[PDB]
């Protein structure tokens, strides 16, 4: 599906950015704004100017998700972005720090965007990961699709709004206007950076702030004698809802793509785990 990409940089790896552009263009995609690989106001305008980006059915790809989004949140024109996304929505995709903007979008107007690969980390990596490439196009091209993996957890079925992304970024939003108030959801979390104790401290905060227990289920993506198993065990000891581990999701070279704010059905059985996702915007045919 040959597509139009529009690069945004709300958050040094220019060679990998070019390698990503070259791969996309070589494969017959077009890049709307190649010129912007040559400050606050300029990073801010990358986002606010999306409300005036009216190219048809466009994939808006975050270039990198190192830090910077947090500075922007109070100056983003949320209403104009939410208005934009009411018709021929941009298909907005990124991860890591980009999670904060994604959550902001959800909180102001249930705008669905894709927690998934970025130009530098994924598309311009030394090897393009096929698993990641597959799941990206899988999500953007199919109005209903299913992710399968060998998850670890109780056998169960839950259905609700899919949300989450990067754990630290989601924590950074508690207390603020940009925390989405989603209940009875399937909450998917990743943070491949952090020390286990920090992961635990953050999961606990989600617990004691009342976010985790109000969901229908919790899925943990990529994270890497006190280790991560102790953290899962302790969290499970607090929760009366299923917590499933083992999804390839986050900043590993393997990551699925997840439409935050879409509808999902989680089904975990002895045979393995399925997540069926629908309602997100797709490439049009």
The contact set with a second copy (CB under 8 A) reads 66-67, 70-71, 73-74, 168, 171-178, 197-198, 200-202, 204-205, 208-211, 234, 238
Work out how close the CB of 184 gets to a second copy at its nearest, in angstroms, rounded to a whole number.
19
- 156 vs 74: CA distance, rounded Å: 40
The DSSP secondary-structure symbol of 88 reads S
Task: Return the number of the residue (191 or 248) whose C-beta is nearest a second copy.
Answer: 191
Strand partners, 245: 152
- Smallest distance, a second copy to C-beta of residue 201, A: 5
| Parallel, antiparallel or unpaired: strands 156-166 and 263-269 | antiparallel
Residue with Cβ nearer a second copy (63 or 112): 63
Instruction: Report how far residue 15's alpha carbon sits from residue 234's, in angstroms, rounded to the nearest whole number.
Output: 43
Q: What are 167's two structure tokens?
A: 């754990």
Q: Least distance from C-beta 235 to a second copy, angstroms? A: 10
CB of 54 to a second copy, least distance (A): 31
Q: How far apart are CA 244 and CA 217, in angstroms?
A: 8
Query: Which residue lies nearer to a second copy by CB, 58 or 215?
Result: 215
Dist CA 30 CA 43 (whole Å): 22
**Angle at CA 70, nearest 5°, toward 245 and 114?**
45
Compute the least distance from the CB of residue 208 to a second copy, in Å. 4
| Three-state SS sequence of 28-65 | CCEECCCCCCCCHHHHHHHHHHHHHCCCCCCEEEECCC
């Amino acid at each position: 599906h040959m597509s139009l990409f529009h690069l945004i940089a709300p958050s040094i790896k220019q060679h990998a950015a070019l390698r990503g552009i070259q791969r996309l263009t070589d494969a017959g995609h077009q890049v709307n704004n190649v010129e912007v690989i040559a400050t606050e106001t300029e990073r801010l305008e990358d986002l606010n100017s999306l409300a005036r980006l009216t190219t048809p059915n466009t994939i808006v790809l975050a270039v990198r998700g190192g830090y910077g989004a947090s500075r922007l949140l109070a100056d983003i024109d949320w209403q104009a972005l939410v208005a934009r996304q009411q018709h021929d929505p941009l298909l907005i995709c990124g991860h890591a720090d980009f999670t904060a903007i994604q959550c902001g979008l959800l909180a102001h107007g249930n705008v669905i965007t894709f927690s998934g690969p970025m130009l530098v980390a994924n598309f311009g990596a030394d090897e393009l990961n096929a698993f990641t490439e597959h799941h990206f196009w899988l999500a953007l091209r199919n109005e209903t699709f299913t992710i399968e993996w060998q998850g670890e957890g109780p056998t169960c079925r839950a259905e609700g709004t899919l949300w989450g992304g990067n754990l630290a970024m989601l924590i950074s939003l508690i207390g603020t206007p940009w925390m989405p108030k989603i209940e009875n959801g399937i909450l998917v979390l990743e943070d491949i950076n952090e020390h286990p104790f920090r992961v635990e401290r953050m999961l606990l905060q989600l617990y004691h702030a009342g976010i985790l227990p109000r969901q229908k289920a919790i899925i943990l993506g990529s994270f890497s004698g006190y280790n991560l198993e102790s953290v899962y065990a302790f969290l499970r000891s607090r929760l009366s809802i299923p917590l499933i581990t083992g999804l390839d999701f986050g900043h590993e070279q393997r990551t699925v793509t997840l439409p935050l704010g879409a509808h999902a059905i989680l089904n975990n059985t002895r045979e393995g785990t399925q997540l069926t996702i629908s309602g997100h915007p797709v490439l049009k045919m």
